[PDB]
Amino acid sequence: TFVALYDYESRTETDLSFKKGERLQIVNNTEGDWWLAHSLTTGQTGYIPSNYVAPS
């Protein structure tokens, strides 16, 4: 239940670019780095930077 703080602008297709206010099921998350997120739709993955996301 996190929120996209900023509109992460990924350059590779791997990282899924999200928007401030999009749904993202955060997966792992150790130190402020680059945790991965999974959308609750088809089952895609996207390395979302922790600096661009935040718990509500």
Swiss-Prot record:
Posttranslational modification: The phosphorylated form is termed pp60c-src.
Self-association state and partner proteins as the record states: Forms a complex with polyoma virus middle T antigen. Interacts with AFAP-110. Interacts with GJA1 and PXN.
Function statement: Non-receptor protein tyrosine kinase which is activated following engagement of many different classes of cellular receptors including immune response receptors, integrins and other adhesion receptors, receptor protein tyrosine kinases, G protein-coupled receptors as well as cytokine receptors. Participates in signaling pathways that control a diverse spectrum of biological activities including gene transcription, immune response, cell adhesion, cell cycle progression, apoptosis, migration, and transformation.
Subcellular compartments: Cell membrane; Mitochondrion inner membrane; Endosome membrane; Nucleus
Domain SH3: 1-56
Portion of the full-length sequence here: 85 to 140 of 533
Tissue-by-tissue expression: Expressed to high levels, and with a high degree of kinase activity, in certain fully differentiated cells such as neurons, platelets and macrophages. Isoform 1 is widely expressed. Isoform 2 is expressed only in the muscle.
Family: Belongs to the protein kinase superfamily. Tyr protein kinase family. SRC subfamily.
Annotated protein name in UniProt: Proto-oncogene tyrosine-protein kinase Src
Organism: Gallus gallus
